[PDB]
């Protein structure tokens, strides 16, 4: 299914715009989106293995991909965790399913957010990447209200060939990211 809005948006819109704002010399220098990643701090589902499957399967739909797991390693006496056992959710997506997800993001997820205001422009890693946090996961389309046993939160990131956050800021804004100016 190699075809979509954001697909060409980067090409026939953002690509030349980047050549305007900074001007390059080669197509492999122009800041390319190429890696989206999701994460969930599940110190909660440590007890219930059941609650673990739920988060992953809700995740599989929203990500439009296959979910994954990742346990701790040097863990919290303070919060009931110790070695290789508990859990942490993660799912990396690229290529096509990457764009399809970005679509649901700034066209469905971001809009119906609890008093959405914009994405904090400080959330740049200083380099050419961006990380953002999100509470309710039901803000996604396919997610039904009468199905979420808990408002499990999660935070996503995105890698880019960008080497400066200015390039990132311009690149993401052109991509349609509602930055809280």
């Amino acid at each position: 299914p190699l075809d979509l809005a954001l697909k060409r948006k980067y090409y026939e819109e953002v690509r030349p715009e980047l050549i305007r704002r900074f001007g390059y010399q080669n197509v492999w220098e122009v800041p390319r989106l190429e890696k989206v990643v999701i994460n969930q701090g599940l110190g909660e589902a440590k007890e219930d293995a059941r609650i673990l499957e739920k988060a992953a399967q809700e995740l599989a739909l929203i990500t439009g991909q296959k979910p994954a797991v990742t346990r701790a390693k040097k863990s919290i006496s303070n919060f009931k965790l110790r070695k290789g056992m508990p859990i942490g959710l993660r799912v990396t997506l690229r290529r096509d399913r990457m764009w399809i997800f970005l679509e649901k993001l700034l066209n469905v997820a971001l809009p119906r957010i609890r008093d959405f205001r914009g994405l904090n422009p400080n959330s740049f890693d200083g380099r050419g990447n961006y990380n953002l946090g999100l509470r309710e996961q039901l803000i996604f389309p396919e997610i039904t209200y009468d199905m979420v046993d808990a408002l499990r939160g999660m935070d996503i990131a995105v890698v880019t060939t960008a080497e400066t956050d200015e390039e990132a800021r311009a690149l993401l804004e052109l991509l349609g990211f509602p930055f809280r100016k």
């Binding site: 299914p1 075809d3 979509l4 809005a5 739909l61 439009g64 399809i100 679509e103 649901k104 700034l106 066209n107 469905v108 809009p111 119906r112 389309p141 396919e142």
Partner: peptide
């Protein structure tokens, strides 16, 4: 499959995702 976002405010976009009948609301149209 072409996921037709039927957001209740006047917008039906033919994206790509599971189930074309995607009932949404308050999308980018409003």
């Amino acid at each position: 499959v072409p996921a037709r976002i039927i957001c209740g405010c006047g917008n039906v976009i033919e994206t790509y995702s599971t189930k074309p009948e995607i009932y949404v609301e308050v999308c980018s149209k409003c």
